Tab-separated table of C-alpha atoms in Angstrom:
chain	number	residue	atom	x	y	z
A	1	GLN	CA	-90.848	14.839	73.893
A	2	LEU	CA	-89.797	11.319	75.322
A	3	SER	CA	-90.202	9.027	72.175
A	4	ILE	CA	-91.705	5.207	72.432
A	5	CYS	CA	-87.901	3.843	71.658
A	6	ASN	CA	-86.467	5.311	74.823
A	7	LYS	CA	-89.359	3.678	77.263
A	8	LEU	CA	-88.365	0.519	75.864
A	9	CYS	CA	-84.630	0.836	76.308
A	10	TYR	CA	-85.495	2.405	80.263
A	11	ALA	CA	-87.751	-0.902	80.287
A	12	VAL	CA	-85.048	-3.224	78.944
A	13	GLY	CA	-82.904	-2.941	82.693
A	14	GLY	CA	-86.025	-4.813	84.211
A	15	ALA	CA	-85.102	-7.537	83.548
A	16	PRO	CA	-81.641	-8.453	85.280
A	17	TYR	CA	-82.370	-7.669	88.899
A	18	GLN	CA	-86.078	-9.044	89.114
A	19	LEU	CA	-84.466	-12.462	87.227
A	20	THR	CA	-81.651	-13.274	88.782
A	21	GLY	CA	-83.540	-12.979	92.265
A	22	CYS	CA	-86.052	-14.992	91.519
A	23	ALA	CA	-83.955	-18.090	89.210
A	24	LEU	CA	-81.509	-17.545	92.593
A	25	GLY	CA	-84.207	-17.822	95.584
A	26	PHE	CA	-86.014	-20.795	93.971
A	27	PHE	CA	-82.931	-22.781	93.593
A	28	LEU	CA	-80.191	-21.957	95.943
A	29	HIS	CA	-81.636	-24.494	98.219
A	30	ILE	CA	-82.184	-27.782	96.452
A	31	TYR	CA	-78.223	-26.983	94.589
A	32	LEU	CA	-76.405	-27.061	97.811
A	33	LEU	CA	-77.757	-30.694	99.134
A	34	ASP	CA	-78.085	-32.113	95.823
A	35	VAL	CA	-75.282	-31.137	94.093
A	36	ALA	CA	-73.144	-29.878	96.152
A	37	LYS	CA	-72.699	-32.282	99.065
A	38	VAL	CA	-72.945	-30.254	101.929
A	39	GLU	CA	-74.156	-30.768	105.151
A	40	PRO	CA	-78.356	-29.346	105.592
A	41	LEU	CA	-76.602	-26.915	108.642
A	42	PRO	CA	-74.378	-25.215	106.500
A	43	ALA	CA	-76.632	-24.760	103.897
A	44	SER	CA	-79.764	-23.211	106.402
A	45	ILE	CA	-76.611	-20.976	107.537
A	46	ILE	CA	-76.090	-19.464	103.832
A	47	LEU	CA	-79.280	-19.179	103.007
A	48	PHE	CA	-80.647	-16.892	106.306
A	49	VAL	CA	-76.800	-15.279	106.650
A	50	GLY	CA	-77.567	-14.437	102.261
A	51	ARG	CA	-81.044	-12.891	102.682
A	52	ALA	CA	-80.037	-11.101	105.722
A	53	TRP	CA	-76.927	-9.326	104.292
A	54	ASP	CA	-79.139	-7.331	101.303
A	55	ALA	CA	-81.485	-6.056	103.351
A	56	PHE	CA	-78.597	-5.039	105.626
A	57	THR	CA	-76.693	-3.539	102.109
A	58	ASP	CA	-79.768	-1.729	100.715
A	59	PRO	CA	-79.244	1.235	102.950
A	60	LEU	CA	-75.618	1.333	102.746
A	61	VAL	CA	-75.476	1.872	99.139
A	62	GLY	CA	-78.609	4.262	99.577
A	63	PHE	CA	-76.580	6.324	101.706
A	64	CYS	CA	-73.577	6.507	100.084
A	65	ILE	CA	-74.873	6.923	96.783
A	66	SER	CA	-76.189	10.146	97.857
A	67	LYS	CA	-73.135	12.097	98.273
A	68	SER	CA	-71.856	10.865	94.820
A	69	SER	CA	-69.847	14.485	93.414
A	70	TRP	CA	-71.441	14.276	89.633
A	71	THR	CA	-68.735	13.030	87.041
A	72	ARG	CA	-67.488	13.906	84.064
A	73	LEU	CA	-70.405	11.197	82.690
A	74	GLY	CA	-72.906	11.274	84.783
A	75	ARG	CA	-73.615	11.202	88.285
A	76	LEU	CA	-76.701	8.461	88.674
A	77	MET	CA	-75.819	5.918	85.718
A	78	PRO	CA	-71.296	5.851	86.134
A	79	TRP	CA	-72.423	3.262	89.235
A	80	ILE	CA	-74.028	0.593	86.622
A	81	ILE	CA	-71.348	0.442	84.389
A	82	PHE	CA	-68.677	-0.229	86.997
A	83	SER	CA	-70.316	-3.273	88.091
A	84	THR	CA	-72.647	-5.192	85.735
A	85	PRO	CA	-68.655	-6.325	84.825
A	86	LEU	CA	-67.417	-7.752	88.292
A	87	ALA	CA	-71.174	-8.500	89.036
A	88	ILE	CA	-71.459	-11.746	85.935
A	89	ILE	CA	-67.875	-12.996	87.131
A	90	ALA	CA	-69.262	-13.410	90.986
A	91	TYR	CA	-72.396	-14.542	89.575
A	92	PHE	CA	-70.745	-17.045	86.849
A	93	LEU	CA	-68.704	-18.671	90.220
A	94	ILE	CA	-71.657	-19.487	92.634
A	95	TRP	CA	-73.503	-22.124	90.459
A	96	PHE	CA	-70.843	-24.969	90.648
A	97	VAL	CA	-68.293	-26.407	92.428
A	98	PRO	CA	-64.906	-26.849	91.490
A	99	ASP	CA	-63.213	-26.714	94.859
A	100	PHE	CA	-61.159	-29.372	95.490
A	101	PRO	CA	-59.238	-28.970	99.124
A	102	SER	CA	-58.111	-32.139	98.404
A	103	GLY	CA	-60.810	-34.498	100.363
A	104	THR	CA	-63.560	-32.227	100.100
A	105	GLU	CA	-63.651	-31.001	103.780
A	106	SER	CA	-67.158	-28.492	104.750
A	107	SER	CA	-66.058	-26.239	106.755
A	108	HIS	CA	-62.689	-25.582	104.247
A	109	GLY	CA	-65.254	-26.062	101.304
A	110	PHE	CA	-68.931	-23.810	101.523
A	111	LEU	CA	-66.530	-20.179	102.102
A	112	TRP	CA	-67.298	-21.248	98.387
A	113	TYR	CA	-70.312	-20.405	98.654
A	114	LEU	CA	-71.373	-18.050	101.472
A	115	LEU	CA	-68.598	-14.717	100.210
A	116	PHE	CA	-69.793	-15.184	96.381
A	117	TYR	CA	-73.295	-15.002	97.493
A	118	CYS	CA	-72.976	-12.038	99.458
A	119	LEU	CA	-70.176	-10.130	97.028
A	120	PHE	CA	-73.538	-11.216	94.213
A	121	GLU	CA	-75.753	-9.631	95.856
A	122	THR	CA	-74.063	-6.664	97.369
A	123	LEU	CA	-73.059	-6.384	93.933
A	124	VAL	CA	-76.920	-5.993	92.458
A	125	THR	CA	-77.648	-4.469	95.096
A	126	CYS	CA	-75.152	-1.533	93.635
A	127	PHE	CA	-76.977	-1.783	90.481
A	128	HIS	CA	-80.270	-1.851	90.953
A	129	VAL	CA	-81.450	1.705	93.362
A	130	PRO	CA	-79.949	3.572	91.184
A	131	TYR	CA	-82.192	2.474	88.410
A	132	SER	CA	-84.913	2.513	90.039
A	133	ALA	CA	-83.886	5.850	90.712
A	134	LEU	CA	-83.341	7.073	87.004
A	135	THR	CA	-87.102	7.234	86.876
A	136	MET	CA	-86.528	10.830	88.290
A	137	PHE	CA	-84.041	12.437	85.947
A	138	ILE	CA	-85.935	12.032	82.170
A	139	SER	CA	-87.084	15.189	81.279
A	140	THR	CA	-89.124	16.446	85.016
A	141	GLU	CA	-92.111	15.627	83.412
A	142	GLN	CA	-95.071	14.492	85.528
A	143	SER	CA	-97.032	12.358	83.026
A	144	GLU	CA	-93.439	10.746	82.072
A	145	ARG	CA	-92.432	9.861	84.859
A	146	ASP	CA	-95.885	7.073	85.605
A	147	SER	CA	-95.377	6.144	82.116
A	148	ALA	CA	-91.940	5.397	81.990
A	149	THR	CA	-92.971	3.527	85.819
A	150	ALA	CA	-95.289	1.301	83.525
A	151	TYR	CA	-93.207	-0.150	81.499
A	152	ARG	CA	-90.713	-0.693	84.103
A	153	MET	CA	-93.037	-2.676	86.653
A	154	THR	CA	-94.247	-4.488	83.108
A	155	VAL	CA	-91.024	-6.465	82.181
A	156	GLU	CA	-90.008	-7.018	85.829
A	157	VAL	CA	-93.401	-9.242	86.050
A	158	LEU	CA	-91.671	-11.049	83.010
A	159	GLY	CA	-88.837	-11.481	84.574
A	160	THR	CA	-90.781	-13.456	87.324
A	161	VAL	CA	-91.883	-15.204	84.624
A	162	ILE	CA	-89.343	-16.409	82.242
A	163	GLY	CA	-86.434	-16.518	85.049
A	164	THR	CA	-88.092	-19.907	86.860
A	165	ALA	CA	-89.223	-21.339	83.027
A	166	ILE	CA	-85.963	-20.792	81.767
A	167	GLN	CA	-83.973	-22.770	85.247
A	168	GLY	CA	-87.056	-25.523	84.415
A	169	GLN	CA	-87.049	-26.416	81.573
A	170	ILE	CA	-82.906	-26.350	81.354
A	171	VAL	CA	-83.358	-28.319	84.101
A	172	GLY	CA	-86.180	-30.638	85.077
A	173	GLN	CA	-87.773	-30.526	88.367
A	174	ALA	CA	-87.374	-33.201	90.592
A	175	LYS	CA	-89.450	-36.552	90.021
A	176	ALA	CA	-93.161	-36.515	92.559
A	177	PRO	CA	-94.169	-39.154	94.136
A	178	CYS	CA	-97.729	-40.122	93.601
A	179	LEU	CA	-99.968	-39.293	90.539
A	180	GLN	CA	-103.312	-38.795	89.633
A	181	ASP	CA	-105.936	-40.842	88.011
A	182	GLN	CA	-107.474	-38.963	85.570
A	183	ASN	CA	-111.011	-39.723	87.532
A	184	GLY	CA	-109.254	-38.268	90.354
A	185	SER	CA	-107.560	-40.960	92.517
A	186	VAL	CA	-103.814	-40.901	93.405
A	187	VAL	CA	-101.200	-44.049	92.993
A	188	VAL	CA	-98.270	-44.285	95.794
A	189	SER	CA	-94.736	-44.676	94.113
A	190	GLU	CA	-91.718	-45.208	94.521
A	191	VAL	CA	-88.601	-44.542	92.693
A	192	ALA	CA	-86.217	-46.908	94.780
A	193	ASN	CA	-83.054	-45.347	92.964
A	194	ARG	CA	-79.494	-44.759	94.520
A	195	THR	CA	-78.687	-41.749	92.483
A	196	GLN	CA	-75.097	-41.976	92.760
A	197	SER	CA	-73.879	-42.336	89.889
A	198	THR	CA	-71.044	-39.623	88.992
A	199	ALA	CA	-71.876	-39.679	85.165
A	200	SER	CA	-75.369	-37.838	86.012
A	201	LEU	CA	-73.841	-35.905	88.872
A	202	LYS	CA	-70.837	-34.093	86.045
A	203	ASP	CA	-73.501	-33.923	83.420
A	204	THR	CA	-76.381	-31.875	86.276
A	205	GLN	CA	-73.435	-29.550	86.454
A	206	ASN	CA	-72.297	-29.213	83.059
A	207	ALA	CA	-76.406	-27.984	82.919
A	208	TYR	CA	-76.176	-25.827	85.495
A	209	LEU	CA	-73.347	-24.480	83.923
A	210	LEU	CA	-75.303	-23.548	80.836
A	211	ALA	CA	-78.188	-21.891	82.923
A	212	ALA	CA	-76.415	-19.862	84.919
A	213	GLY	CA	-74.184	-18.633	81.789
A	214	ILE	CA	-77.375	-17.885	79.075
A	215	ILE	CA	-78.699	-15.539	82.086
A	216	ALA	CA	-75.248	-13.951	82.421
A	217	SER	CA	-75.339	-13.237	78.554
A	218	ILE	CA	-78.820	-12.322	78.951
A	219	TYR	CA	-78.040	-9.846	81.695
A	220	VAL	CA	-75.225	-8.655	79.549
A	221	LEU	CA	-77.100	-8.243	77.336
A	222	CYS	CA	-79.459	-5.986	79.410
A	223	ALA	CA	-77.454	-3.881	80.837
A	224	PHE	CA	-75.759	-2.623	77.664
A	225	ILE	CA	-79.029	-1.885	76.648
A	226	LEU	CA	-79.849	0.230	78.885
A	227	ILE	CA	-76.175	1.967	79.040
A	228	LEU	CA	-77.170	3.309	75.296
A	229	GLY	CA	-80.606	4.901	74.713
A	230	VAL	CA	-81.610	6.793	77.603
A	231	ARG	CA	-80.266	10.130	78.929
A	232	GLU	CA	-79.262	11.315	82.411
A	233	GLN	CA	-80.409	14.563	82.171
A	234	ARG	CA	-78.390	17.607	83.511
A	235	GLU	CA	-79.273	19.277	87.022
A	236	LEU	CA	-80.289	22.574	85.181
A	237	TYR	CA	-80.851	24.544	89.006
A	238	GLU	CA	-78.618	25.459	91.451
A	239	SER	CA	-78.671	22.921	93.415
A	240	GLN	CA	-76.052	22.009	95.625
A	241	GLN	CA	-74.054	22.561	99.572
A	242	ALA	CA	-74.179	25.304	101.073
A	243	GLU	CA	-72.257	26.254	104.666
A	244	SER	CA	-75.222	24.494	106.636
A	245	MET	CA	-76.488	20.686	106.468
A	246	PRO	CA	-74.286	18.709	107.913
A	247	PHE	CA	-73.086	15.432	107.238
A	248	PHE	CA	-76.265	13.880	108.363
A	249	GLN	CA	-78.611	16.792	107.564
A	250	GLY	CA	-80.768	14.906	104.633
A	251	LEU	CA	-81.089	11.406	106.320
A	252	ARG	CA	-82.127	12.780	109.717
A	253	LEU	CA	-84.743	14.784	107.764
A	254	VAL	CA	-85.999	12.539	105.022
A	255	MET	CA	-87.293	10.540	108.061
A	256	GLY	CA	-90.236	12.254	109.169
A	257	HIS	CA	-91.602	13.579	106.274
A	258	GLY	CA	-95.525	13.134	107.073
A	259	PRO	CA	-96.725	11.585	103.852
A	260	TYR	CA	-94.237	9.318	102.795
A	261	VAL	CA	-94.091	7.672	106.389
A	262	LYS	CA	-97.623	7.074	105.544
A	263	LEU	CA	-97.278	6.150	102.036
A	264	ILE	CA	-94.803	3.821	103.284
A	265	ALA	CA	-97.199	2.048	106.213
A	266	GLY	CA	-99.932	0.977	103.047
A	267	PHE	CA	-97.734	-0.061	100.745
A	268	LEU	CA	-95.433	-1.937	103.493
A	269	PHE	CA	-99.122	-3.982	104.668
A	270	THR	CA	-100.445	-4.700	101.085
A	271	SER	CA	-96.857	-5.698	100.047
A	272	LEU	CA	-96.779	-8.504	102.931
A	273	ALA	CA	-100.512	-9.568	101.927
A	274	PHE	CA	-99.724	-10.556	98.268
A	275	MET	CA	-96.666	-12.251	98.933
A	276	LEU	CA	-98.809	-14.009	101.203
A	277	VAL	CA	-101.037	-15.036	98.908
A	278	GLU	CA	-99.295	-16.198	95.776
A	279	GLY	CA	-96.148	-17.561	97.822
A	280	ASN	CA	-98.913	-20.129	99.841
A	281	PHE	CA	-101.209	-20.248	97.326
A	282	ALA	CA	-98.429	-21.958	94.948
A	283	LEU	CA	-99.927	-25.592	96.947
A	284	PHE	CA	-102.801	-24.341	98.430
A	285	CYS	CA	-104.828	-26.137	95.311
A	286	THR	CA	-102.106	-29.165	95.954
A	287	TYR	CA	-103.424	-30.682	99.077
A	288	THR	CA	-106.989	-28.667	100.648
A	289	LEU	CA	-107.872	-29.140	97.530
A	290	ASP	CA	-107.434	-31.521	94.085
A	291	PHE	CA	-105.337	-30.784	90.947
A	292	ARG	CA	-102.046	-31.957	92.493
A	293	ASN	CA	-101.587	-32.508	88.648
A	294	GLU	CA	-102.050	-29.194	86.859
A	295	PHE	CA	-100.673	-26.614	89.581
A	296	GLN	CA	-97.680	-25.801	87.848
A	297	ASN	CA	-99.845	-24.675	84.671
A	298	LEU	CA	-102.343	-22.501	87.593
A	299	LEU	CA	-99.076	-20.563	89.377
A	300	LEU	CA	-98.321	-19.342	85.955
A	301	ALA	CA	-100.953	-18.503	84.409
A	302	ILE	CA	-101.582	-16.056	88.163
A	303	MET	CA	-98.259	-14.411	87.749
A	304	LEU	CA	-99.282	-14.281	83.655
A	305	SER	CA	-102.374	-12.409	84.120
A	306	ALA	CA	-100.733	-9.173	86.282
A	307	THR	CA	-98.515	-8.744	83.098
A	308	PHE	CA	-101.344	-7.573	80.571
A	309	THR	CA	-102.784	-5.777	82.866
A	310	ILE	CA	-100.877	-3.441	84.017
A	311	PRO	CA	-100.866	-1.905	80.655
A	312	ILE	CA	-104.948	-1.065	80.681
A	313	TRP	CA	-103.945	-0.395	85.291
A	314	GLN	CA	-102.605	2.278	84.828
A	315	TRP	CA	-103.937	3.565	82.063
A	316	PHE	CA	-107.452	3.311	84.054
A	317	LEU	CA	-105.318	5.558	86.125
A	318	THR	CA	-104.472	7.910	83.516
A	319	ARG	CA	-108.319	8.910	84.049
A	320	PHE	CA	-109.332	10.208	87.332
A	321	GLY	CA	-106.508	7.796	89.175
A	322	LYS	CA	-103.639	8.227	91.199
A	323	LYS	CA	-104.809	7.546	94.620
A	324	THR	CA	-108.708	6.993	92.780
A	325	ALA	CA	-107.111	3.494	92.044
A	326	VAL	CA	-106.122	1.523	94.863
A	327	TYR	CA	-109.264	0.723	96.239
A	328	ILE	CA	-110.643	-0.767	93.169
A	329	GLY	CA	-108.162	-3.104	92.704
A	330	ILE	CA	-107.452	-4.764	96.259
A	331	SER	CA	-111.653	-4.115	96.206
A	332	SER	CA	-111.524	-5.938	93.310
A	333	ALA	CA	-109.167	-8.794	95.488
A	334	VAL	CA	-112.016	-9.065	98.341
A	335	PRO	CA	-114.677	-10.837	96.695
A	336	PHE	CA	-113.369	-13.600	94.946
A	337	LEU	CA	-110.744	-14.478	98.016
A	338	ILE	CA	-113.755	-14.754	100.352
A	339	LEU	CA	-115.238	-16.324	97.497
A	340	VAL	CA	-112.851	-19.491	96.753
A	341	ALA	CA	-112.588	-21.018	100.271
A	342	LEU	CA	-116.121	-21.721	99.764
A	343	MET	CA	-117.947	-23.661	96.756
A	344	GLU	CA	-114.902	-26.138	96.491
A	345	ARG	CA	-114.061	-28.317	93.711
A	346	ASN	CA	-115.104	-27.134	90.203
A	347	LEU	CA	-111.840	-26.626	88.205
A	348	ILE	CA	-113.877	-23.789	86.103
A	349	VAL	CA	-113.816	-21.375	89.636
A	350	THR	CA	-110.684	-21.907	90.332
A	351	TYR	CA	-108.950	-20.372	86.709
A	352	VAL	CA	-111.563	-17.755	87.281
A	353	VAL	CA	-110.002	-16.575	90.760
A	354	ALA	CA	-107.032	-16.646	90.073
A	355	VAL	CA	-106.941	-14.712	86.623
A	356	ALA	CA	-108.729	-11.781	89.774
A	357	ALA	CA	-106.059	-12.539	91.625
A	358	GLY	CA	-103.623	-11.777	88.924
A	359	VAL	CA	-105.294	-8.111	88.458
A	360	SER	CA	-105.608	-7.302	91.788
A	361	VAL	CA	-101.549	-8.408	92.315
A	362	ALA	CA	-101.141	-6.005	88.740
A	363	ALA	CA	-102.851	-3.003	91.744
A	364	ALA	CA	-100.206	-3.461	94.124
A	365	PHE	CA	-97.195	-3.729	92.199
A	366	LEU	CA	-98.302	-0.770	90.221
A	367	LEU	CA	-99.863	1.613	92.449
A	368	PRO	CA	-97.361	2.053	95.602
A	369	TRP	CA	-94.588	2.395	93.140
A	370	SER	CA	-96.257	5.324	90.632
A	371	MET	CA	-97.273	6.993	94.019
A	372	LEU	CA	-94.191	8.482	95.486
A	373	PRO	CA	-92.331	11.299	93.036
A	374	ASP	CA	-95.068	12.577	93.711
A	375	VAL	CA	-94.359	12.845	97.275
A	376	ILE	CA	-90.947	13.285	95.913
A	377	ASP	CA	-92.550	16.801	94.752
A	378	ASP	CA	-94.130	17.564	98.262
A	379	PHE	CA	-90.661	16.955	99.608
A	380	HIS	CA	-89.129	19.524	96.984
A	381	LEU	CA	-91.512	22.103	97.260
A	382	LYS	CA	-92.393	21.875	101.318
A	383	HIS	CA	-88.844	22.752	101.274
A	384	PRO	CA	-85.714	25.110	100.144
A	385	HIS	CA	-83.358	24.609	98.039
A	386	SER	CA	-81.848	20.391	100.060
A	387	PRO	CA	-79.452	19.684	97.516
A	388	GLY	CA	-80.738	16.640	97.494
A	389	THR	CA	-81.688	13.028	99.123
A	390	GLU	CA	-84.004	11.359	95.851
A	391	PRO	CA	-81.883	7.930	95.415
A	392	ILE	CA	-82.886	8.005	99.765
A	393	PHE	CA	-86.704	7.232	99.731
A	394	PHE	CA	-86.280	4.531	97.233
A	395	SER	CA	-83.116	2.876	99.471
A	396	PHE	CA	-86.081	2.543	102.078
A	397	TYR	CA	-88.672	1.413	99.789
A	398	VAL	CA	-86.988	-1.760	98.937
A	399	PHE	CA	-85.618	-2.449	102.300
A	400	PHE	CA	-89.135	-2.610	103.207
A	401	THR	CA	-89.911	-4.647	100.053
A	402	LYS	CA	-87.410	-6.685	101.235
A	403	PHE	CA	-88.677	-6.640	104.430
A	404	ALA	CA	-92.506	-7.730	103.466
A	405	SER	CA	-90.673	-10.527	101.287
A	406	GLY	CA	-88.574	-12.026	104.435
A	407	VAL	CA	-91.025	-11.994	106.419
A	408	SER	CA	-94.138	-13.729	104.274
A	409	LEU	CA	-92.316	-16.811	104.480
A	410	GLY	CA	-91.082	-16.702	107.844
A	411	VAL	CA	-94.724	-16.587	109.126
A	412	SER	CA	-95.610	-19.077	106.473
A	413	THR	CA	-93.275	-21.903	107.545
A	414	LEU	CA	-93.850	-21.091	111.226
A	415	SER	CA	-97.979	-21.286	110.864
A	416	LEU	CA	-97.644	-24.408	109.372
A	417	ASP	CA	-94.613	-25.624	111.118
A	418	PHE	CA	-96.945	-25.384	113.754
A	419	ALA	CA	-99.537	-28.171	112.569
A	420	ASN	CA	-97.805	-31.914	111.848
A	421	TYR	CA	-96.727	-30.592	108.233
A	422	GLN	CA	-95.655	-34.263	107.261
A	423	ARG	CA	-92.224	-33.654	104.871
A	424	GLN	CA	-92.347	-36.448	102.502
A	425	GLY	CA	-95.672	-38.407	101.956
A	426	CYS	CA	-98.504	-37.703	99.945
A	427	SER	CA	-100.920	-36.664	102.590
A	428	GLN	CA	-102.103	-34.094	105.206
A	429	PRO	CA	-102.657	-33.525	108.472
A	430	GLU	CA	-106.328	-32.034	109.226
A	431	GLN	CA	-105.263	-28.941	110.057
A	432	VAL	CA	-103.084	-28.056	107.993
A	433	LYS	CA	-105.721	-28.303	105.240
A	434	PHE	CA	-107.123	-25.949	107.231
A	435	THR	CA	-104.754	-23.149	108.415
A	436	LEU	CA	-103.323	-23.315	104.928
A	437	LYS	CA	-107.372	-21.969	103.577
A	438	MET	CA	-106.951	-20.263	105.938
A	439	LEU	CA	-103.439	-18.325	105.473
A	440	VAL	CA	-104.632	-18.140	101.782
A	441	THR	CA	-108.474	-16.513	102.298
A	442	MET	CA	-108.818	-14.776	105.655
A	443	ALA	CA	-105.514	-13.213	106.497
A	444	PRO	CA	-104.871	-11.682	103.333
A	445	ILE	CA	-108.570	-9.792	103.869
A	446	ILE	CA	-108.120	-8.329	107.004
A	447	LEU	CA	-104.377	-6.560	106.017
A	448	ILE	CA	-105.559	-5.269	102.727
A	449	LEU	CA	-108.920	-4.271	105.315
A	450	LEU	CA	-106.151	-2.546	107.612
A	451	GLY	CA	-104.176	-1.010	104.949
A	452	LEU	CA	-106.728	0.543	102.792
A	453	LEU	CA	-108.094	2.408	106.224
A	454	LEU	CA	-105.016	3.675	107.379
A	455	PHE	CA	-104.283	4.670	103.236
A	456	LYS	CA	-104.981	7.765	103.881
A	457	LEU	CA	-102.581	9.216	102.376
A	458	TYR	CA	-101.948	13.005	101.922
A	459	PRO	CA	-102.307	14.116	97.798
A	460	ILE	CA	-104.940	14.101	96.887
A	461	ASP	CA	-105.683	14.575	93.187
A	462	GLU	CA	-105.996	18.701	94.351
A	463	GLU	CA	-102.541	18.129	95.787
A	464	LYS	CA	-100.681	16.919	92.962
A	465	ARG	CA	-102.654	19.470	90.305
A	466	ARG	CA	-101.830	22.758	92.180
A	467	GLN	CA	-97.793	21.512	93.029
A	468	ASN	CA	-97.401	20.456	89.341
A	469	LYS	CA	-97.543	24.588	88.800
A	470	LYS	CA	-95.542	25.762	91.698
A	471	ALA	CA	-92.435	22.935	90.485
A	472	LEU	CA	-90.978	25.292	87.593
A	473	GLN	CA	-88.859	27.655	88.795
């Protein structure tokens, strides 16, 4: 029934959040220290508050989107159309410094950043959850939900890849301090540049403005593509609220559902492990190994390899898959990760292990999201009418995703800082090159094995193949 054009239309909506988040999280820490002249402590406090506020908004938006009456134009979709036109300007404000408070008073100054960052975070949260919830209000067909999910999570990976590349080719990366000879040797250097010319500053501000404008334009184009082409199917059932079901009737029951919280733990552990792997494999093969001249391409390879495997790794679950495939993917993660810790310095094993790690990243990005709809079917069938709490599961799911990806960085930074991680040198102490390999290789293995042991979700293939029939009328 569903058309390919519909799938493409619904997939285009996977760019905006995953695009802006990647373009921002990598860059709103060098921005506040070289263009907007702000003291380092305020920059740190901005980062902390901004990262904290999203996690505390996501569940609130998820809760408050359930108590929304069906309007004349869609129940879920209107939240999108009333959010993008206010998002752009908000985003477009955060990326330049117009603030001239008669002398650039810092305390009078940085408030132009915190509030705008928070507002953008809340607006993007308002856009994300309904978009990720639309995946169950399309024709209510068992297979087509997973089919749409596959094309949704291909676009997110491509967005993460493209967002950093656009910004990088627009604004050049900071100059490296040492160069590696072709034979293999490090030559120290010193820029010794004042780098305080007003012309260069005024140029860099314009460059950042142009990049922000480009990202905003693609944001709004994707938004307008999404709004036209996919229709939020009308709820044909008599689901509503009876004289029962008080204000917290739903949320008090969504938690403790059984299989849902059991799946949550496995998702959390696997996501934490792979966040560690990517975030620190970024520079693992830069210090404890050689190859200081090409890691910027090796990371691009590992991240891009995850794209062209989502289709095949979902075709693999269309046949004898769907919880009979997670084992294979994470197992395929295991051996080359345990390999690269040994058999050092080859320039050839480092690429095959990277591509394999990408093929493994695909599994952890795809499977734990394509499995939840079956849990939703279980919840609907094993309970009475239950007017509806669909956008609650997704909100809690995104919140735990944020939790994992924000505790990964914390653990990494704390563990590295417990060794003498020299900050501005072309050097390495004794332990850092060892703790870094340990944290890239062994701890992911422990989390993987523990999650595999815990990943015993109730709905085996028989459960879904039975619940399909009862889910008609």
